From Swiss-Prot, chains A, C:
Activity regulation information from UniProt: Allosterically activated by fructose 1,6-bisphosphate (FBP).
Protein name: L-lactate dehydrogenase
Residues that, per the record, bind beta-D-fructose 1,6-bisphosphate: R150, H165
Organism encoding this protein: Thermus thermophilus (strain ATCC 27634 / DSM 579 / HB8)
Gene encoding the protein: ldh
Localization per Swiss-Prot or TrEMBL: Cytoplasm
Origin organism lineage: Bacteria, Thermotogati, Deinococcota, Deinococci, Thermales
From Swiss-Prot, chain B:
Subcellular localization: Cytoplasm
Gene encoding the protein: ldh
GO-annotated biological processes: glycolytic process; lactate metabolic process
Subunit structure: Homotetramer.
Lineage, top ranks: Bacteria, Thermotogati, Deinococcota, Deinococci, Thermales
Name of this chain's protein: L-lactate dehydrogenase
Binding site for NAD(+): M10, V11, D32, Y62, G76, V77, A108, T109, N110, S133
Pfam family, one: Ldh_1_N
Temperature dependence: Optimum temperature is close to 90 degrees Celsius.
Length: 310, 303, 310, 303
């Protein structure tokens, strides 16, 4: 099976590196305006594959994305000195306007998996441009924050992460929501389970955890200039769900008819991911304050789509 | 790390095979009165290892269990039968713990809940240290069938089978989650409302599995072999994962000092916590009843 | 991908088990005239799968082999009281006469993987009946013995097994040829490597090791009646090689035009195994002594097959 | 087990990432002067681990290297550079062994062959304990291109690149083996004659790889990251596998006291054996000269 990746900076290349080291697919195709950036990365990574799995990583054009069952969009541009947010956004919006049609031309039946930040808006942009059903365009969304939330929760409780069920919903960013209230451990309420043991989650712990989750990206960018390793592996996992038609549940961003009163916006909710993209939503119980933080996350996101016209 | 298995019949040797194929442990020691049987299974399995993982599978004595961090008891021979097996354990358990005072005991011998209770009493260890495979195959089969019906990955399905492993085990439909939401509410949102005949169909698939396998081939071993290996992995890696395994428990639904499957946290010291699911009146009554026959079976046997 | 197995005894079922636990194919189909036996084994193994990899193991008919890319033939009958080896071979050759056309009817593109003993003659039988090119019919042959030879050499030299290249060739069994002369480690000749390692490999070490390889099957049969775990995993690896078009080198049995002058005979030589089965033979340097042992191994198989009618 | 990585740039951080995704060690510790760079890379990678294996990646000081079996030195500093880096190693090496006295030192810093010699002198350890990545990438690429050309699994191709990592490295065509048989012979059997033209194409493919990668992206790190992770794994598992890595060598073709890549057996204590292949006159002579230039470079820098 073939995976494509458009955009061969750190995020696209680390995604290819993850795909190869985990042996997710037999073929990975890097596509980038800078033909020879794509080539350098592809060849650097090919040097790694003998020490892991038989995986054919190459640089390529959109035509070489033929039969790709999933195409990662980590396209976009290197921000400029003094280039504002909204400015960079308009630029990436225009990159996608060129990327999406070309990808879908070579790989009509590919799920499009959007990585480019801000991921929720770029997801909505690629959805509108694709002219596809909304399930076929999936954004990586909050998956790393969700998993980080699970990890920190599992740690404090002393149980396996895979026993912890817990979400981060909404915008991938400042307004994301940690769903404390219907989080579970082995199928039962989490806060309550904690309590029945050593100590219930304290105010200090909750916000130490909230800060562990919420300001991770800021810490990373502050210290090294950008995040890419984390999302590389998260994208690989999603690619894996798509190629194997897993139908696992992931907090990914997609176009959603309505949420908490807000209409036609892309954001992360728990969704079932398979060979054709997201194929069902799993809406969990929310508390009134989580519900309200979500409406609010949706609206922020809706307004950012307005400013781009999508 | 070394794993021990006492009893080199089909269940024990299949566990060794699953351990080796999955690469769970670097060293696996099969111990059996019939030494030549243990050696033959060990060597057969050793020929497999170049095609999987570096795992030293061998036959040995009780003393070769020294330093083993988990030991599987698969040494099985009506409650006359159940009497013979308790006699065996009265030999096995002291000799395992002599060579390996640190080992978590993983009871596989039928009936597993009773034998888990007897292993416990004989051990003199704390209760978390003696763990019976219990209902893990049935719980997983229950999740598998539900996942298929719902068209969702089994890992998103949290459903339990609890109590006594066998005919009277309790499928806990009532509080089953999926994606963290109620099973039935999720089932409708997938356009597959669970029908009492669906519910009964699935029930049949879980409950009658072992009976079908025995009718066709005379014994079951492939499933529990892999299940025990997964359990051994949990112990060796101090996973603290949740598994519906049997352990001596102070009280279940009023019934005191009985061994049976509940959702339990499993790590390097054995089970170290219970995660008690929500039960409906029917299920609870079933469970308390299950707990009762087991309590007095153990009691008939002097345990 | 789908793999079929005909014959659901201990060899066929242990093979299904190894395929499931190692996650080799998405679907495994066991076919046995004794349907309740096939069904019992498939369902026992299906219960293992939640603890390893998603694999659909099921019992079925020849018709259910359709689209299979490899079918393991572990078909056969139990020796009766006072029946000769050669009488048994008759009855088994007859089992293959029924099996082979039915398998090919339903999965005309499958590589056939023969496991039934004596594997070399049975490979010749499968090949003649199939009507297929020689590359399509492959016997497991001596892969277990070759693997053991290497493991023993490894442990003795203190070096990783994958660094040791030693072959067991010819007829699977007492007649097999351990190729000492051209065995190499790290590319260079075994016997100095041992030297420049502070292990000389007295003639007593080679005798120890020859007994280790040659007499394993006997020891196992004497202690438990049959072997199956070893070949179950050996076969699973051959299947993986076929499904991944690996073109790896294995000492497996195939119909060979000429070996040391003996014509049209099946036995193990080093062979390249890929999606179409064996696609090349690698002939290692042989010593006068080994060459004559191989020649002689070949002509006893040639006779036995012709005497059988193949 | 714990692995240390000193130097948290792209090589050091790609290595930790490789180690994490492949699930090689349970603890990965990153050490860098720029504490925040190390912390950021570590936290970035920690976010990946839920989607691969349970691995604890973290920033730390030399003290946190306690009990590390292997420590990667990718501490080259941004640009006489030699001298510069030679000083770094004078600081780094003593600190590491203080925390991790059984630690094999794994030099990644370029030029890797001299640095491996540097690290060795300062080590005060047995020669095998200091191992430089050397030509492992080029050897693997050489095998990959040959496998591709001959239509055969890479695992079957036994071919080495030896000597100095870089433009004067030696492809050992003469004694290369596929499936145990001489290379050129196997090419025949395949009907895939290795002509001078084909060898030139393959040579360029191997020799000019890093050049091409530097030109398109500015630096190389993904490949060496996975190669180092494999070397680390060999060490942690006491594999005793054969790798073309750089190590201090008493004499090579008559040149004395020089560090360069030869096939070496790699285990828990570092390299514990050298496997010297047959060399054509051309190759032997090219290797001899390379070794000269290195032993000189080693001596002139003060090692």
């Amino acid at each position: 099976m073939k995976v494509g990746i458009v955009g061969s900076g750190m995020v696209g290349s680390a995604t290819a590196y993850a795909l190869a080291l985990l042996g997710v697919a037999r073929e990975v195709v890097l596509v980038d305006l800078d033909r020879k950036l794509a080539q350098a990365h592809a060849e650097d990574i090919l040097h790694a594959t003998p020490f892991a799995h038989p995986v054919w990583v190459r640089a390529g054009s959109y035509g070489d994305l033929e039969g790709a069952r999933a195409v990662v969009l980590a396209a976009g541009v290197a921000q400029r000195p003094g280039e504002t947010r909204l400015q960079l956004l308009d630029r990436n919006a225009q990159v996608f306007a060129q990327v999406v049609p070309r990808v879908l031309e070579a790989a009509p039946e590919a799920v499009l998996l959007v990585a480019t930040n801000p991921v929720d808006v770029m997801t909505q942009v690629a959805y509108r441009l694709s002219g596809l059903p909304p399930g076929r365009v999936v954004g990586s969304g909050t998956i790393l924050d969700t998993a980080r939330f699970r990890a920190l929760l599992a740690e404090y409780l002393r149980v396996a992460p895979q026993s912890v069920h817990a979400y981060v919903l909404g915008e991938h960013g400042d307004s994301e929501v940690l769903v404390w209230s219907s989080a579970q451990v082995g199928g039962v309420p989490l806060l309550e389970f904690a309590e029945a043991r050593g100590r219930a989650l304290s105010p200090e712990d909750r916000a130490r955890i909230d800060e562990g989750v919420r300001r991770a990206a800021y810490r990373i960018i502050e210290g090294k200039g950008a995040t890419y390793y984390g999302i590389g592996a998260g994208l690989a996992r999603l690619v894996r769900a798509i190629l194997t038609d897993e139908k696992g549940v992931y907090t990914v961003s997609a176009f959603t008819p309505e949420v908490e009163g807000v209409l036609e916006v892309s954001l992360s909710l728990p969704r079932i991911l398979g060979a054709g993209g997201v194929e069902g939503t799993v809406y969990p119980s929310l508390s009134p304050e989580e519900r309200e933080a979500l409406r609010r996350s949706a609206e922020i996101l809706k307004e950012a789509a307005f400013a781009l016209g999508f």
